[PDB]
Amino acid sequence: GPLGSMKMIEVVAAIIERDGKILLAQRPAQSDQAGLWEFAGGKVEPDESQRQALVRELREELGIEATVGEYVASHQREVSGRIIHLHAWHVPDFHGTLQAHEHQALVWCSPEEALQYPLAPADIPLLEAFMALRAARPAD
């Protein structure tokens, strides 16, 4: 029925895996509290590429020039009628040093460890399949 009657909000999430651990950045929304970490990334403008968005967003937020390669998983959710389309992609390489611009703390923790923390509701299904990818291995 309604296709174009809905608009998608595209968001790319970068899974920065170094040493076997993933990069988590502390940032909530309107919460006066902290402790909840998120997977760094950003919203995708239609005129920019999904990989390009991650690369530039991480360059702006994390001060790193990331190299996008292997896709992990995608998750869909809604924001008052609008469908947000999140892509968790694994960046196997990054140029620079990770810094937190719009984020408070930056931590490296293993996939299994990460899902035991207060991750955003969208980041959970994404990490679930990331650790799934390492444990089941789609290459078999």
CSV table of C-alpha atoms in Angstrom, one decimal:
chain,number,residue,atom,x,y,z
A,1,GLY,CA,0.0,0.0,0.0
A,2,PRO,CA,2.0,3.0,1.3
A,3,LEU,CA,5.6,2.9,0.0
A,4,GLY,CA,6.6,6.5,-0.6
A,5,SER,CA,4.2,7.6,2.1
A,6,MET,CA,6.9,6.6,4.6
A,7,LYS,CA,10.5,8.0,4.7
A,8,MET,CA,13.5,6.1,5.8
A,9,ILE,CA,16.2,7.5,8.1
A,10,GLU,CA,19.4,6.0,7.1
A,11,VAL,CA,22.0,5.5,9.9
A,12,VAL,CA,25.4,3.8,9.5
A,13,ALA,CA,27.1,2.3,12.5
A,14,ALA,CA,30.8,1.5,12.5
A,15,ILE,CA,32.1,-1.5,14.2
A,16,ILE,CA,35.7,-0.7,14.9
A,17,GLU,CA,37.3,-3.9,15.8
A,18,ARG,CA,40.9,-3.7,17.0
A,19,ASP,CA,42.8,-6.5,18.9
A,20,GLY,CA,39.6,-8.4,18.9
A,21,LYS,CA,37.7,-5.7,20.6
A,22,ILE,CA,35.0,-3.3,19.4
A,23,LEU,CA,35.0,0.5,19.9
A,24,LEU,CA,32.2,1.8,22.0
A,25,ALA,CA,31.5,5.5,22.6
A,26,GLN,CA,29.5,6.8,25.5
A,27,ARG,CA,26.6,9.0,24.4
A,28,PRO,CA,22.9,9.1,25.2
A,29,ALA,CA,20.2,11.4,23.9
A,30,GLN,CA,18.3,13.6,26.4
A,31,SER,CA,19.3,11.4,29.3
A,32,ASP,CA,20.9,13.4,32.1
A,33,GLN,CA,22.7,10.2,33.1
A,34,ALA,CA,25.6,8.4,31.4
A,35,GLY,CA,27.1,5.0,31.1
A,36,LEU,CA,25.3,3.9,28.0
A,37,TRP,CA,27.7,3.4,25.1
A,38,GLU,CA,26.8,3.4,21.4
A,39,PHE,CA,28.5,2.3,18.2
A,40,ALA,CA,30.0,5.3,16.5
A,41,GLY,CA,28.7,6.4,13.1
A,42,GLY,CA,26.0,8.8,11.9
A,43,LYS,CA,23.1,9.5,9.7
A,44,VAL,CA,23.4,9.1,6.0
A,45,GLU,CA,22.5,11.9,3.6
A,46,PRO,CA,21.1,10.6,0.3
A,47,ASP,CA,23.8,12.5,-1.6
A,48,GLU,CA,26.6,10.8,0.3
A,49,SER,CA,27.6,7.1,0.3
A,50,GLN,CA,27.0,4.8,3.2
A,51,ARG,CA,30.7,3.9,3.4
A,52,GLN,CA,31.5,7.6,2.8
A,53,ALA,CA,29.2,8.7,5.6
A,54,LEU,CA,30.9,6.3,8.0
A,55,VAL,CA,34.4,7.4,6.8
A,56,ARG,CA,33.6,11.1,7.2
A,57,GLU,CA,31.5,10.8,10.4
A,58,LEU,CA,34.3,8.9,12.1
A,59,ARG,CA,36.7,11.5,10.7
A,60,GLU,CA,34.6,14.2,12.4
A,61,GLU,CA,33.7,12.4,15.6
A,62,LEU,CA,36.5,9.9,16.1
A,63,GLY,CA,39.2,11.9,14.2
A,64,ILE,CA,39.9,8.7,12.2
A,65,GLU,CA,39.8,7.9,8.5
A,66,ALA,CA,38.2,4.5,8.5
A,67,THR,CA,38.3,1.9,5.8
A,68,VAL,CA,34.9,0.3,5.2
A,69,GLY,CA,34.8,-3.3,4.0
A,70,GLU,CA,32.9,-6.2,5.4
A,71,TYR,CA,29.2,-5.6,6.2
A,72,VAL,CA,28.0,-7.1,9.5
A,73,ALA,CA,24.3,-6.6,9.8
A,74,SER,CA,21.4,-4.2,9.3
A,75,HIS,CA,18.5,-3.3,11.6
A,76,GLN,CA,15.3,-1.4,11.1
A,77,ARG,CA,13.3,0.5,13.7
A,78,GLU,CA,10.9,3.4,13.6
A,79,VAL,CA,11.0,6.9,15.0
A,80,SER,CA,7.4,8.2,15.2
A,81,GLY,CA,6.2,6.8,11.9
A,82,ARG,CA,9.7,7.1,10.2
A,83,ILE,CA,11.7,4.0,9.5
A,84,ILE,CA,15.3,4.2,10.6
A,85,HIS,CA,17.6,1.9,8.7
A,86,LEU,CA,20.8,1.1,10.6
A,87,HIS,CA,23.8,-0.6,9.0
A,88,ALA,CA,26.5,-2.1,11.2
A,89,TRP,CA,29.6,-2.4,9.1
A,90,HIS,CA,33.0,-3.6,10.2
A,91,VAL,CA,35.9,-1.3,9.5
A,92,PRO,CA,39.0,-3.5,9.4
A,93,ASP,CA,41.3,-0.5,9.1
A,94,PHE,CA,41.4,3.1,10.3
A,95,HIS,CA,43.9,5.9,9.8
A,96,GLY,CA,44.6,8.1,12.7
A,97,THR,CA,43.9,7.9,16.4
A,98,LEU,CA,40.4,7.5,17.9
A,99,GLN,CA,39.1,10.5,19.8
A,100,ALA,CA,35.7,11.4,21.1
A,101,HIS,CA,34.1,14.6,19.8
A,102,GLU,CA,30.4,14.4,20.6
A,103,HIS,CA,31.1,11.4,22.9
A,104,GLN,CA,32.3,11.3,26.5
A,105,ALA,CA,34.3,8.1,26.9
A,106,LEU,CA,35.8,5.6,24.4
A,107,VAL,CA,36.3,2.0,25.3
A,108,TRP,CA,37.4,-1.2,23.6
A,109,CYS,CA,35.5,-4.4,24.7
A,110,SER,CA,35.0,-7.8,23.1
A,111,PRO,CA,31.7,-8.5,21.2
A,112,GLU,CA,30.3,-10.8,23.9
A,113,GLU,CA,31.3,-8.3,26.6
A,114,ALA,CA,29.6,-5.4,24.7
A,115,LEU,CA,26.1,-6.9,24.6
A,116,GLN,CA,26.2,-7.2,28.4
A,117,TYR,CA,26.4,-3.4,28.6
A,118,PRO,CA,23.6,-0.7,28.3
A,119,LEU,CA,23.8,-0.4,24.5
A,120,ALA,CA,21.1,1.4,22.5
A,121,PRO,CA,18.1,-0.8,21.5
A,122,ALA,CA,19.3,-0.7,17.9
A,123,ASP,CA,22.9,-1.6,18.6
A,124,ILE,CA,21.9,-4.8,20.4
A,125,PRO,CA,20.6,-6.7,17.2
A,126,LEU,CA,23.6,-5.4,15.3
A,127,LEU,CA,26.2,-6.6,17.8
A,128,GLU,CA,24.2,-9.9,18.2
A,129,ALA,CA,25.0,-10.7,14.6
A,130,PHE,CA,28.5,-9.4,14.8
A,131,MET,CA,29.4,-11.9,17.5
A,132,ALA,CA,27.3,-14.4,15.5
A,133,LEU,CA,29.5,-13.8,12.5
A,134,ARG,CA,32.6,-14.6,14.5
A,135,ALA,CA,31.2,-17.6,16.3
A,136,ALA,CA,29.2,-19.2,13.5
A,137,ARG,CA,31.4,-17.9,10.8
A,138,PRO,CA,29.6,-17.2,7.4
A,139,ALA,CA,32.6,-18.6,5.7
A,140,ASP,CA,31.8,-22.3,6.0
